[PDB]
Amino acid sequence: NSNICEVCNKWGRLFCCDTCPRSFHEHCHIPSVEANKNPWSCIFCRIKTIQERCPESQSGHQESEVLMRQMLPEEQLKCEFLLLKVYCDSKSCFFASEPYYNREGSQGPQKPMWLNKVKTSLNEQMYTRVEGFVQDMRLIFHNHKEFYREDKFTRLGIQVQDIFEKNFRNIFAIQETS
Ligand SMILES: [Zn+2]
Ligand SMILES: [Zn+2]
Ligand SMILES: [Zn+2]
């Protein structure tokens, strides 16, 4: 097994996957690492199994169809993994916890949003369709762009949104386009 957490790249109290060499902090894994279960298989492994059990699941899909999917177990997992892929980027730190807004010339967003809120909402099964999760994720970056205006800090939202979108297209096998 690796000696650092796959998500945050730090050592510490790590839980090791039984079917691959990755390791995790308890609350870095999504869902949080399960109490018992020997062997234990990480989210990366669980996602790989879905693809292996249904190879045709990798054929191209339309985003509009993906968004309307109900949050059955496999879609729940895919959103958990997409969320985790964002937290894998160190720039996710800026979007993790509850923001506050007091900048001359800007007004805060009407609906603030942040990663840990999305994480809780997934854990509490508050999304009934993939669309709910994706909307909240895109809202994080849209709020940031609007608030920061011409400050160069706006670029951090563009950057982390790009990680989200690339991973969304990979995990849900969105049809490639020009
Ligand atoms: Zn970690
Ligand atoms: Zn694994
Ligand atoms: Zn099949």
Side-chain angles (χ1 to χ4, degrees), residues 109-145:
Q110 303 294 317
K111 188 176 167 183
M113 196 47 62
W114 59 101
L115 300 170
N116 293 349
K117 188 174 170 63
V118 175
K119 183 177 283 197
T120 291
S121 294
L122 274 173
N123 178 239
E124 288 179 0
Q125 299 162 301
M126 301 288 313
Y127 301 111
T128 57
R129 293 170 195 273
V130 169
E131 186 178 46
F133 164 82
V134 171
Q135 282 168 348
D136 277 354
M137 296 290 287
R138 290 175 165 164
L139 182 63
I140 300 170
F141 312 115
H142 193 262
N143 282 352
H144 177 96
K145 288 162 90 162

PDB file of all heavy atoms in Angstrom, residues 109-145:
ATOM      1  N   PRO A 109     -23.210  35.933  -2.916  1.00  0.00           N
ATOM      2  CA  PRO A 109     -24.218  35.193  -3.672  1.00  0.00           C
ATOM      3  C   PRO A 109     -25.488  34.963  -2.858  1.00  0.00           C
ATOM      4  O   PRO A 109     -25.449  34.742  -1.635  1.00  0.00           O
ATOM      5  CB  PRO A 109     -23.467  33.857  -3.943  1.00  0.00           C
ATOM      6  CG  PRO A 109     -22.540  33.695  -2.816  1.00  0.00           C
ATOM      7  CD  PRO A 109     -22.028  35.159  -2.631  1.00  0.00           C
ATOM      8  N   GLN A 110     -26.605  34.828  -3.596  1.00  0.00           N
ATOM      9  CA  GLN A 110     -27.890  34.529  -3.028  1.00  0.00           C
ATOM     10  C   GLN A 110     -27.966  33.160  -2.424  1.00  0.00           C
ATOM     11  O   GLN A 110     -28.678  32.983  -1.405  1.00  0.00           O
ATOM     12  CB  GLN A 110     -28.984  34.635  -4.088  1.00  0.00           C
ATOM     13  CG  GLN A 110     -29.069  35.975  -4.790  1.00  0.00           C
ATOM     14  CD  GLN A 110     -29.476  37.075  -3.860  1.00  0.00           C
ATOM     15  OE1 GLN A 110     -30.383  36.926  -3.040  1.00  0.00           O
ATOM     16  NE2 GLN A 110     -28.777  38.187  -3.950  1.00  0.00           N
ATOM     17  N   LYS A 111     -27.219  32.194  -3.017  1.00  0.00           N
ATOM     18  CA  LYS A 111     -27.197  30.832  -2.525  1.00  0.00           C
ATOM     19  C   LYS A 111     -25.792  30.309  -2.364  1.00  0.00           C
ATOM     20  O   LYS A 111     -25.223  29.678  -3.308  1.00  0.00           O
ATOM     21  CB  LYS A 111     -27.985  29.938  -3.456  1.00  0.00           C
ATOM     22  CG  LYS A 111     -28.157  28.523  -2.884  1.00  0.00           C
ATOM     23  CD  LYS A 111     -29.036  27.655  -3.796  1.00  0.00           C
ATOM     24  CE  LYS A 111     -28.957  26.188  -3.434  1.00  0.00           C
ATOM     25  NZ  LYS A 111     -29.801  25.514  -4.479  1.00  0.00           N
ATOM     26  N   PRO A 112     -25.160  30.534  -1.208  1.00  0.00           N
ATOM     27  CA  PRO A 112     -23.812  30.081  -1.043  1.00  0.00           C
ATOM     28  C   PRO A 112     -23.747  28.546  -1.072  1.00  0.00           C
ATOM     29  O   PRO A 112     -24.749  27.863  -0.774  1.00  0.00           O
ATOM     30  CB  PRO A 112     -23.423  30.598   0.378  1.00  0.00           C
ATOM     31  CG  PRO A 112     -24.337  31.792   0.583  1.00  0.00           C
ATOM     32  CD  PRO A 112     -25.621  31.433  -0.112  1.00  0.00           C
ATOM     33  N   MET A 113     -22.604  28.008  -1.481  1.00  0.00           N
ATOM     34  CA  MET A 113     -22.387  26.601  -1.619  1.00  0.00           C
ATOM     35  C   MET A 113     -20.940  26.283  -1.458  1.00  0.00           C
ATOM     36  O   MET A 113     -20.036  27.076  -1.815  1.00  0.00           O
ATOM     37  CB  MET A 113     -22.887  26.119  -3.025  1.00  0.00           C
ATOM     38  CG  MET A 113     -23.081  24.605  -3.221  1.00  0.00           C
ATOM     39  SD  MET A 113     -23.960  23.700  -1.943  1.00  0.00           S
ATOM     40  CE  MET A 113     -25.484  24.515  -2.070  1.00  0.00           C
ATOM     41  N   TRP A 114     -20.654  25.115  -0.951  1.00  0.00           N
ATOM     42  CA  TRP A 114     -19.323  24.688  -0.660  1.00  0.00           C
ATOM     43  C   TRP A 114     -19.213  23.201  -0.628  1.00  0.00           C
ATOM     44  O   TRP A 114     -20.282  22.502  -0.512  1.00  0.00           O
ATOM     45  CB  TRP A 114     -18.775  25.359   0.697  1.00  0.00           C
ATOM     46  CG  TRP A 114     -19.557  25.083   1.929  1.00  0.00           C
ATOM     47  CD1 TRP A 114     -19.230  24.189   2.860  1.00  0.00           C
ATOM     48  CD2 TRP A 114     -20.739  25.717   2.358  1.00  0.00           C
ATOM     49  NE1 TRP A 114     -20.137  24.227   3.886  1.00  0.00           N
ATOM     50  CE2 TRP A 114     -21.059  25.172   3.620  1.00  0.00           C
ATOM     51  CE3 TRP A 114     -21.554  26.722   1.834  1.00  0.00           C
ATOM     52  CZ2 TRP A 114     -22.207  25.561   4.317  1.00  0.00           C
ATOM     53  CZ3 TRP A 114     -22.697  27.129   2.525  1.00  0.00           C
ATOM     54  CH2 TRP A 114     -23.025  26.503   3.767  1.00  0.00           C
ATOM     55  N   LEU A 115     -18.001  22.691  -0.729  1.00  0.00           N
ATOM     56  CA  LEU A 115     -17.770  21.195  -0.938  1.00  0.00           C
ATOM     57  C   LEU A 115     -18.309  20.399   0.219  1.00  0.00           C
ATOM     58  O   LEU A 115     -18.975  19.342   0.046  1.00  0.00           O
ATOM     59  CB  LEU A 115     -16.372  20.808  -1.276  1.00  0.00           C
ATOM     60  CG  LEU A 115     -15.777  21.425  -2.569  1.00  0.00           C
ATOM     61  CD1 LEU A 115     -14.298  21.167  -2.685  1.00  0.00           C
ATOM     62  CD2 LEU A 115     -16.467  20.822  -3.867  1.00  0.00           C
ATOM     63  N   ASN A 116     -17.966  20.826   1.429  1.00  0.00           N
ATOM     64  CA  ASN A 116     -18.434  20.064   2.613  1.00  0.00           C
ATOM     65  C   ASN A 116     -19.947  20.021   2.739  1.00  0.00           C
ATOM     66  O   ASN A 116     -20.456  19.082   3.271  1.00  0.00           O
ATOM     67  CB  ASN A 116     -17.813  20.642   3.884  1.00  0.00           C
ATOM     68  CG  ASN A 116     -16.298  20.443   3.994  1.00  0.00           C
ATOM     69  OD1 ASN A 116     -15.634  19.712   3.265  1.00  0.00           O
ATOM     70  ND2 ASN A 116     -15.700  21.186   4.979  1.00  0.00           N
ATOM     71  N   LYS A 117     -20.675  21.019   2.281  1.00  0.00           N
ATOM     72  CA  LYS A 117     -22.134  21.040   2.206  1.00  0.00           C
ATOM     73  C   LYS A 117     -22.618  19.991   1.194  1.00  0.00           C
ATOM     74  O   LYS A 117     -23.520  19.244   1.515  1.00  0.00           O
ATOM     75  CB  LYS A 117     -22.689  22.392   1.914  1.00  0.00           C
ATOM     76  CG  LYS A 117     -24.192  22.506   2.006  1.00  0.00           C
ATOM     77  CD  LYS A 117     -24.574  23.959   1.828  1.00  0.00           C
ATOM     78  CE  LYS A 117     -26.053  24.207   1.658  1.00  0.00           C
ATOM     79  NZ  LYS A 117     -26.663  23.751   2.913  1.00  0.00           N
ATOM     80  N   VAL A 118     -21.949  19.916   0.059  1.00  0.00           N
ATOM     81  CA  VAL A 118     -22.290  18.888  -0.976  1.00  0.00           C
ATOM     82  C   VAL A 118     -22.014  17.518  -0.431  1.00  0.00           C
ATOM     83  O   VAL A 118     -22.836  16.555  -0.598  1.00  0.00           O
ATOM     84  CB  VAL A 118     -21.600  19.181  -2.345  1.00  0.00           C
ATOM     85  CG1 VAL A 118     -21.913  18.005  -3.299  1.00  0.00           C
ATOM     86  CG2 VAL A 118     -22.012  20.525  -2.920  1.00  0.00           C
ATOM     87  N   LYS A 119     -20.882  17.338   0.278  1.00  0.00           N
ATOM     88  CA  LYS A 119     -20.536  16.111   0.919  1.00  0.00           C
ATOM     89  C   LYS A 119     -21.641  15.642   1.932  1.00  0.00           C
ATOM     90  O   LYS A 119     -22.074  14.490   1.875  1.00  0.00           O
ATOM     91  CB  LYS A 119     -19.201  16.205   1.630  1.00  0.00           C
ATOM     92  CG  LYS A 119     -18.759  14.939   2.241  1.00  0.00           C
ATOM     93  CD  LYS A 119     -17.392  14.962   2.915  1.00  0.00           C
ATOM     94  CE  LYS A 119     -16.274  14.915   1.919  1.00  0.00           C
ATOM     95  NZ  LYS A 119     -15.025  14.530   2.624  1.00  0.00           N
ATOM     96  N   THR A 120     -22.055  16.545   2.775  1.00  0.00           N
ATOM     97  CA  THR A 120     -23.150  16.246   3.725  1.00  0.00           C
ATOM     98  C   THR A 120     -24.457  15.880   3.007  1.00  0.00           C
ATOM     99  O   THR A 120     -25.197  14.947   3.387  1.00  0.00           O
ATOM    100  CB  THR A 120     -23.315  17.399   4.658  1.00  0.00           C
ATOM    101  OG1 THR A 120     -22.137  17.389   5.459  1.00  0.00           O
ATOM    102  CG2 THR A 120     -24.610  17.221   5.497  1.00  0.00           C
ATOM    103  N   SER A 121     -24.750  16.616   1.956  1.00  0.00           N
ATOM    104  CA  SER A 121     -25.991  16.425   1.221  1.00  0.00           C
ATOM    105  C   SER A 121     -25.975  15.060   0.559  1.00  0.00           C
ATOM    106  O   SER A 121     -27.008  14.330   0.583  1.00  0.00           O
ATOM    107  CB  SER A 121     -26.234  17.497   0.156  1.00  0.00           C
ATOM    108  OG  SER A 121     -26.447  18.847   0.720  1.00  0.00           O
ATOM    109  N   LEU A 122     -24.841  14.659   0.043  1.00  0.00           N
ATOM    110  CA  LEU A 122     -24.735  13.252  -0.487  1.00  0.00           C
ATOM    111  C   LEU A 122     -24.855  12.207   0.562  1.00  0.00           C
ATOM    112  O   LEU A 122     -25.555  11.136   0.398  1.00  0.00           O
ATOM    113  CB  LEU A 122     -23.410  13.054  -1.194  1.00  0.00           C
ATOM    114  CG  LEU A 122     -23.284  13.410  -2.602  1.00  0.00           C
ATOM    115  CD1 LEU A 122     -21.825  13.284  -3.005  1.00  0.00           C
ATOM    116  CD2 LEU A 122     -24.110  12.441  -3.527  1.00  0.00           C
ATOM    117  N   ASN A 123     -24.193  12.411   1.683  1.00  0.00           N
ATOM    118  CA  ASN A 123     -24.255  11.479   2.816  1.00  0.00           C
ATOM    119  C   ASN A 123     -25.679  11.320   3.337  1.00  0.00           C
ATOM    120  O   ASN A 123     -26.048  10.193   3.761  1.00  0.00           O
ATOM    121  CB  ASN A 123     -23.324  11.935   3.952  1.00  0.00           C
ATOM    122  CG  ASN A 123     -23.378  11.011   5.202  1.00  0.00           C
ATOM    123  OD1 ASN A 123     -23.711  11.436   6.330  1.00  0.00           O
ATOM    124  ND2 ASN A 123     -22.987   9.814   5.017  1.00  0.00           N
ATOM    125  N   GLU A 124     -26.487  12.379   3.321  1.00  0.00           N
ATOM    126  CA  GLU A 124     -27.822  12.396   3.907  1.00  0.00           C
ATOM    127  C   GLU A 124     -28.879  11.998   2.805  1.00  0.00           C
ATOM    128  O   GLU A 124     -30.048  12.100   3.040  1.00  0.00           O
ATOM    129  CB  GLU A 124     -28.114  13.751   4.574  1.00  0.00           C
ATOM    130  CG  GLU A 124     -27.271  13.874   5.866  1.00  0.00           C
ATOM    131  CD  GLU A 124     -27.391  15.175   6.699  1.00  0.00           C
ATOM    132  OE1 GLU A 124     -28.167  16.106   6.327  1.00  0.00           O
ATOM    133  OE2 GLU A 124     -26.676  15.273   7.765  1.00  0.00           O
ATOM    134  N   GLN A 125     -28.415  11.601   1.628  1.00  0.00           N
ATOM    135  CA  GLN A 125     -29.259  11.198   0.471  1.00  0.00           C
ATOM    136  C   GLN A 125     -30.249  12.298   0.177  1.00  0.00           C
ATOM    137  O   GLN A 125     -31.420  12.047  -0.024  1.00  0.00           O
ATOM    138  CB  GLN A 125     -29.937   9.844   0.755  1.00  0.00           C
ATOM    139  CG  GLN A 125     -28.946   8.711   0.988  1.00  0.00           C
ATOM    140  CD  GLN A 125     -29.530   7.490   1.677  1.00  0.00           C
ATOM    141  OE1 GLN A 125     -30.033   7.599   2.770  1.00  0.00           O
ATOM    142  NE2 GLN A 125     -29.317   6.345   1.098  1.00  0.00           N
ATOM    143  N   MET A 126     -29.791  13.539   0.017  1.00  0.00           N
ATOM    144  CA  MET A 126     -30.667  14.667  -0.259  1.00  0.00           C
ATOM    145  C   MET A 126     -30.842  14.913  -1.738  1.00  0.00           C
ATOM    146  O   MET A 126     -31.702  15.681  -2.129  1.00  0.00           O
ATOM    147  CB  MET A 126     -30.143  15.974   0.369  1.00  0.00           C
ATOM    148  CG  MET A 126     -29.999  15.865   1.872  1.00  0.00           C
ATOM    149  SD  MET A 126     -31.520  15.832   2.811  1.00  0.00           S
ATOM    150  CE  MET A 126     -32.508  17.166   2.139  1.00  0.00           C
ATOM    151  N   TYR A 127     -30.042  14.279  -2.580  1.00  0.00           N
ATOM    152  CA  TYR A 127     -30.210  14.460  -4.024  1.00  0.00           C
ATOM    153  C   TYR A 127     -31.010  13.274  -4.576  1.00  0.00           C
ATOM    154  O   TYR A 127     -30.658  12.150  -4.332  1.00  0.00           O
ATOM    155  CB  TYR A 127     -28.895  14.565  -4.777  1.00  0.00           C
ATOM    156  CG  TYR A 127     -27.989  15.706  -4.325  1.00  0.00           C
ATOM    157  CD1 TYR A 127     -26.787  15.441  -3.652  1.00  0.00           C
ATOM    158  CD2 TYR A 127     -28.345  16.948  -4.535  1.00  0.00           C
ATOM    159  CE1 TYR A 127     -25.945  16.473  -3.275  1.00  0.00           C
ATOM    160  CE2 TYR A 127     -27.542  18.023  -4.099  1.00  0.00           C
ATOM    161  CZ  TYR A 127     -26.302  17.748  -3.512  1.00  0.00           C
ATOM    162  OH  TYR A 127     -25.474  18.784  -3.078  1.00  0.00           O
ATOM    163  N   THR A 128     -32.078  13.578  -5.301  1.00  0.00           N
ATOM    164  CA  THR A 128     -32.859  12.512  -5.950  1.00  0.00           C
ATOM    165  C   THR A 128     -32.421  12.228  -7.362  1.00  0.00           C
ATOM    166  O   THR A 128     -32.714  11.117  -7.861  1.00  0.00           O
ATOM    167  CB  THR A 128     -34.361  12.812  -5.975  1.00  0.00           C
ATOM    168  OG1 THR A 128     -34.565  14.045  -6.633  1.00  0.00           O
ATOM    169  CG2 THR A 128     -34.949  12.861  -4.538  1.00  0.00           C
ATOM    170  N   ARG A 129     -31.758  13.190  -8.035  1.00  0.00           N
ATOM    171  CA  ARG A 129     -31.217  12.981  -9.363  1.00  0.00           C
ATOM    172  C   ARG A 129     -29.785  13.532  -9.472  1.00  0.00           C
ATOM    173  O   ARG A 129     -29.409  14.456  -8.746  1.00  0.00           O
ATOM    174  CB  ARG A 129     -32.060  13.656 -10.468  1.00  0.00           C
ATOM    175  CG  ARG A 129     -33.463  13.008 -10.628  1.00  0.00           C
ATOM    176  CD  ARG A 129     -34.368  13.769 -11.504  1.00  0.00           C
ATOM    177  NE  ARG A 129     -35.762  13.306 -11.331  1.00  0.00           N
ATOM    178  CZ  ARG A 129     -36.370  12.308 -11.959  1.00  0.00           C
ATOM    179  NH1 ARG A 129     -35.789  11.560 -12.948  1.00  0.00           N
ATOM    180  NH2 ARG A 129     -37.648  12.087 -11.572  1.00  0.00           N
ATOM    181  N   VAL A 130     -29.064  13.003 -10.425  1.00  0.00           N
ATOM    182  CA  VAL A 130     -27.684  13.462 -10.668  1.00  0.00           C
ATOM    183  C   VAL A 130     -27.692  15.001 -10.837  1.00  0.00           C
ATOM    184  O   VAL A 130     -26.729  15.705 -10.402  1.00  0.00           O
ATOM    185  CB  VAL A 130     -27.008  12.783 -11.828  1.00  0.00           C
ATOM    186  CG1 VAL A 130     -25.709  13.444 -12.232  1.00  0.00           C
ATOM    187  CG2 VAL A 130     -26.759  11.325 -11.526  1.00  0.00           C
ATOM    188  N   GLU A 131     -28.700  15.546 -11.518  1.00  0.00           N
ATOM    189  CA  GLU A 131     -28.808  16.970 -11.736  1.00  0.00           C
ATOM    190  C   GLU A 131     -28.633  17.838 -10.442  1.00  0.00           C
ATOM    191  O   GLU A 131     -28.013  18.895 -10.498  1.00  0.00           O
ATOM    192  CB  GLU A 131     -30.206  17.263 -12.318  1.00  0.00           C
ATOM    193  CG  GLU A 131     -30.434  18.645 -12.730  1.00  0.00           C
ATOM    194  CD  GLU A 131     -31.853  18.777 -13.344  1.00  0.00           C
ATOM    195  OE1 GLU A 131     -32.817  18.239 -12.729  1.00  0.00           O
ATOM    196  OE2 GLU A 131     -31.897  19.316 -14.469  1.00  0.00           O
ATOM    197  N   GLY A 132     -29.178  17.386  -9.343  1.00  0.00           N
ATOM    198  CA  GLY A 132     -29.104  18.101  -8.044  1.00  0.00           C
ATOM    199  C   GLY A 132     -27.676  18.249  -7.613  1.00  0.00           C
ATOM    200  O   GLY A 132     -27.252  19.376  -7.166  1.00  0.00           O
ATOM    201  N   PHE A 133     -26.913  17.191  -7.734  1.00  0.00           N
ATOM    202  CA  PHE A 133     -25.541  17.209  -7.314  1.00  0.00           C
ATOM    203  C   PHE A 133     -24.710  18.108  -8.248  1.00  0.00           C
ATOM    204  O   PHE A 133     -23.925  18.967  -7.835  1.00  0.00           O
ATOM    205  CB  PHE A 133     -25.004  15.791  -7.261  1.00  0.00           C
ATOM    206  CG  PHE A 133     -23.511  15.671  -7.212  1.00  0.00           C
ATOM    207  CD1 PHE A 133     -22.847  15.816  -5.990  1.00  0.00           C
ATOM    208  CD2 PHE A 133     -22.722  15.453  -8.356  1.00  0.00           C
ATOM    209  CE1 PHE A 133     -21.450  15.734  -5.933  1.00  0.00           C
ATOM    210  CE2 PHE A 133     -21.311  15.372  -8.310  1.00  0.00           C
ATOM    211  CZ  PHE A 133     -20.687  15.525  -7.071  1.00  0.00           C
ATOM    212  N   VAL A 134     -24.857  17.927  -9.570  1.00  0.00           N
ATOM    213  CA  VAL A 134     -24.098  18.672 -10.528  1.00  0.00           C
ATOM    214  C   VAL A 134     -24.429  20.162 -10.412  1.00  0.00           C
ATOM    215  O   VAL A 134     -23.534  20.982 -10.502  1.00  0.00           O
ATOM    216  CB  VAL A 134     -24.303  18.137 -12.004  1.00  0.00           C
ATOM    217  CG1 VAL A 134     -23.689  19.055 -13.026  1.00  0.00           C
ATOM    218  CG2 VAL A 134     -23.737  16.712 -12.035  1.00  0.00           C
ATOM    219  N   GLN A 135     -25.679  20.510 -10.199  1.00  0.00           N
ATOM    220  CA  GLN A 135     -26.075  21.928 -10.070  1.00  0.00           C
ATOM    221  C   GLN A 135     -25.334  22.552  -8.881  1.00  0.00           C
ATOM    222  O   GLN A 135     -24.850  23.695  -9.006  1.00  0.00           O
ATOM    223  CB  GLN A 135     -27.579  22.154  -9.907  1.00  0.00           C
ATOM    224  CG  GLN A 135     -28.257  22.014 -11.289  1.00  0.00           C
ATOM    225  CD  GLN A 135     -29.781  21.922 -11.204  1.00  0.00           C
ATOM    226  OE1 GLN A 135     -30.395  21.741 -10.131  1.00  0.00           O
ATOM    227  NE2 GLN A 135     -30.401  21.971 -12.406  1.00  0.00           N
ATOM    228  N   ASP A 136     -25.377  21.907  -7.754  1.00  0.00           N
ATOM    229  CA  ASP A 136     -24.668  22.458  -6.558  1.00  0.00           C
ATOM    230  C   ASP A 136     -23.186  22.577  -6.790  1.00  0.00           C
ATOM    231  O   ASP A 136     -22.544  23.568  -6.403  1.00  0.00           O
ATOM    232  CB  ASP A 136     -24.866  21.588  -5.338  1.00  0.00           C
ATOM    233  CG  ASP A 136     -26.234  21.892  -4.598  1.00  0.00           C
ATOM    234  OD1 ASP A 136     -26.935  22.842  -4.991  1.00  0.00           O
ATOM    235  OD2 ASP A 136     -26.565  21.115  -3.668  1.00  0.00           O
ATOM    236  N   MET A 137     -22.576  21.582  -7.442  1.00  0.00           N
ATOM    237  CA  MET A 137     -21.149  21.676  -7.752  1.00  0.00           C
ATOM    238  C   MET A 137     -20.836  22.837  -8.668  1.00  0.00           C
ATOM    239  O   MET A 137     -19.894  23.641  -8.348  1.00  0.00           O
ATOM    240  CB  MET A 137     -20.603  20.379  -8.327  1.00  0.00           C
ATOM    241  CG  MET A 137     -20.664  19.202  -7.374  1.00  0.00           C
ATOM    242  SD  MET A 137     -19.442  19.405  -5.992  1.00  0.00           S
ATOM    243  CE  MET A 137     -17.900  19.100  -6.826  1.00  0.00           C
ATOM    244  N   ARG A 138     -21.635  23.045  -9.725  1.00  0.00           N
ATOM    245  CA  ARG A 138     -21.321  24.125 -10.654  1.00  0.00           C
ATOM    246  C   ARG A 138     -21.602  25.512 -10.000  1.00  0.00           C
ATOM    247  O   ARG A 138     -20.894  26.486 -10.326  1.00  0.00           O
ATOM    248  CB  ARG A 138     -22.152  23.949 -11.959  1.00  0.00           C
ATOM    249  CG  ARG A 138     -21.648  22.736 -12.775  1.00  0.00           C
ATOM    250  CD  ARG A 138     -22.536  22.485 -13.987  1.00  0.00           C
ATOM    251  NE  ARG A 138     -21.830  21.581 -14.915  1.00  0.00           N
ATOM    252  CZ  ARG A 138     -22.409  20.909 -15.914  1.00  0.00           C
ATOM    253  NH1 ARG A 138     -23.729  20.954 -16.056  1.00  0.00           N
ATOM    254  NH2 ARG A 138     -21.643  20.205 -16.726  1.00  0.00           N
ATOM    255  N   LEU A 139     -22.496  25.520  -9.019  1.00  0.00           N
ATOM    256  CA  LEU A 139     -22.876  26.741  -8.299  1.00  0.00           C
ATOM    257  C   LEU A 139     -21.695  27.254  -7.454  1.00  0.00           C
ATOM    258  O   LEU A 139     -21.465  28.479  -7.334  1.00  0.00           O
ATOM    259  CB  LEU A 139     -24.102  26.485  -7.424  1.00  0.00           C
ATOM    260  CG  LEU A 139     -24.629  27.715  -6.648  1.00  0.00           C
ATOM    261  CD1 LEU A 139     -25.105  28.794  -7.601  1.00  0.00           C
ATOM    262  CD2 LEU A 139     -25.693  27.283  -5.696  1.00  0.00           C
ATOM    263  N   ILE A 140     -20.940  26.308  -6.896  1.00  0.00           N
ATOM    264  CA  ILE A 140     -19.718  26.705  -6.144  1.00  0.00           C
ATOM    265  C   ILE A 140     -18.853  27.606  -7.010  1.00  0.00           C
ATOM    266  O   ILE A 140     -18.385  28.651  -6.576  1.00  0.00           O
ATOM    267  CB  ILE A 140     -18.932  25.481  -5.627  1.00  0.00           C
ATOM    268  CG1 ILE A 140     -19.776  24.624  -4.690  1.00  0.00           C
ATOM    269  CG2 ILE A 140     -17.541  25.812  -5.121  1.00  0.00           C
ATOM    270  CD1 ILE A 140     -19.142  23.288  -4.354  1.00  0.00           C
ATOM    271  N   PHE A 141     -18.564  27.196  -8.231  1.00  0.00           N
ATOM    272  CA  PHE A 141     -17.619  27.926  -9.064  1.00  0.00           C
ATOM    273  C   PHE A 141     -18.236  29.158  -9.638  1.00  0.00           C
ATOM    274  O   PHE A 141     -17.506  30.160  -9.788  1.00  0.00           O
ATOM    275  CB  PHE A 141     -16.982  26.951 -10.096  1.00  0.00           C
ATOM    276  CG  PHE A 141     -16.495  25.684  -9.469  1.00  0.00           C
ATOM    277  CD1 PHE A 141     -17.093  24.469  -9.816  1.00  0.00           C
ATOM    278  CD2 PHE A 141     -15.523  25.708  -8.513  1.00  0.00           C
ATOM    279  CE1 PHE A 141     -16.690  23.261  -9.196  1.00  0.00           C
ATOM    280  CE2 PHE A 141     -15.109  24.514  -7.908  1.00  0.00           C
ATOM    281  CZ  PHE A 141     -15.720  23.312  -8.254  1.00  0.00           C
ATOM    282  N   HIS A 142     -19.520  29.135  -9.975  1.00  0.00           N
ATOM    283  CA  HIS A 142     -20.235  30.267 -10.535  1.00  0.00           C
ATOM    284  C   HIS A 142     -20.301  31.406  -9.487  1.00  0.00           C
ATOM    285  O   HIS A 142     -19.998  32.560  -9.850  1.00  0.00           O
ATOM    286  CB  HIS A 142     -21.604  29.885 -11.000  1.00  0.00           C
ATOM    287  CG  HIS A 142     -22.226  30.939 -11.832  1.00  0.00           C
ATOM    288  ND1 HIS A 142     -23.110  31.848 -11.323  1.00  0.00           N
ATOM    289  CD2 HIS A 142     -22.025  31.288 -13.132  1.00  0.00           C
ATOM    290  CE1 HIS A 142     -23.490  32.679 -12.277  1.00  0.00           C
ATOM    291  NE2 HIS A 142     -22.845  32.368 -13.385  1.00  0.00           N
ATOM    292  N   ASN A 143     -20.546  31.036  -8.235  1.00  0.00           N
ATOM    293  CA  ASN A 143     -20.605  32.061  -7.114  1.00  0.00           C
ATOM    294  C   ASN A 143     -19.262  32.735  -6.999  1.00  0.00           C
ATOM    295  O   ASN A 143     -19.198  33.970  -6.861  1.00  0.00           O
ATOM    296  CB  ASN A 143     -21.002  31.392  -5.816  1.00  0.00           C
ATOM    297  CG  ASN A 143     -22.469  31.105  -5.714  1.00  0.00           C
ATOM    298  OD1 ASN A 143     -23.300  31.510  -6.537  1.00  0.00           O
ATOM    299  ND2 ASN A 143     -22.800  30.389  -4.665  1.00  0.00           N
ATOM    300  N   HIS A 144     -18.201  31.972  -7.080  1.00  0.00           N
ATOM    301  CA  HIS A 144     -16.818  32.455  -6.932  1.00  0.00           C
ATOM    302  C   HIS A 144     -16.495  33.423  -8.063  1.00  0.00           C
ATOM    303  O   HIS A 144     -16.043  34.539  -7.826  1.00  0.00           O
ATOM    304  CB  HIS A 144     -15.876  31.273  -6.883  1.00  0.00           C
ATOM    305  CG  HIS A 144     -14.426  31.643  -6.804  1.00  0.00           C
ATOM    306  ND1 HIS A 144     -13.745  31.714  -5.599  1.00  0.00           N
ATOM    307  CD2 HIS A 144     -13.543  31.973  -7.752  1.00  0.00           C
ATOM    308  CE1 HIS A 144     -12.467  31.971  -5.837  1.00  0.00           C
ATOM    309  NE2 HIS A 144     -12.336  32.224  -7.127  1.00  0.00           N
ATOM    310  N   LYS A 145     -16.821  33.049  -9.281  1.00  0.00           N
ATOM    311  CA  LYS A 145     -16.583  33.940 -10.454  1.00  0.00           C
ATOM    312  C   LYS A 145     -17.299  35.246 -10.346  1.00  0.00           C
ATOM    313  O   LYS A 145     -16.722  36.304 -10.592  1.00  0.00           O
ATOM    314  CB  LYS A 145     -17.036  33.247 -11.722  1.00  0.00           C
ATOM    315  CG  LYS A 145     -16.088  32.147 -12.053  1.00  0.00           C
ATOM    316  CD  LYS A 145     -16.632  31.104 -13.032  1.00  0.00           C
ATOM    317  CE  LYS A 145     -16.314  31.511 -14.438  1.00  0.00           C
ATOM    318  NZ  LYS A 145     -16.460  30.309 -15.313  1.00  0.00           N
TER     319      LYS A 145
END
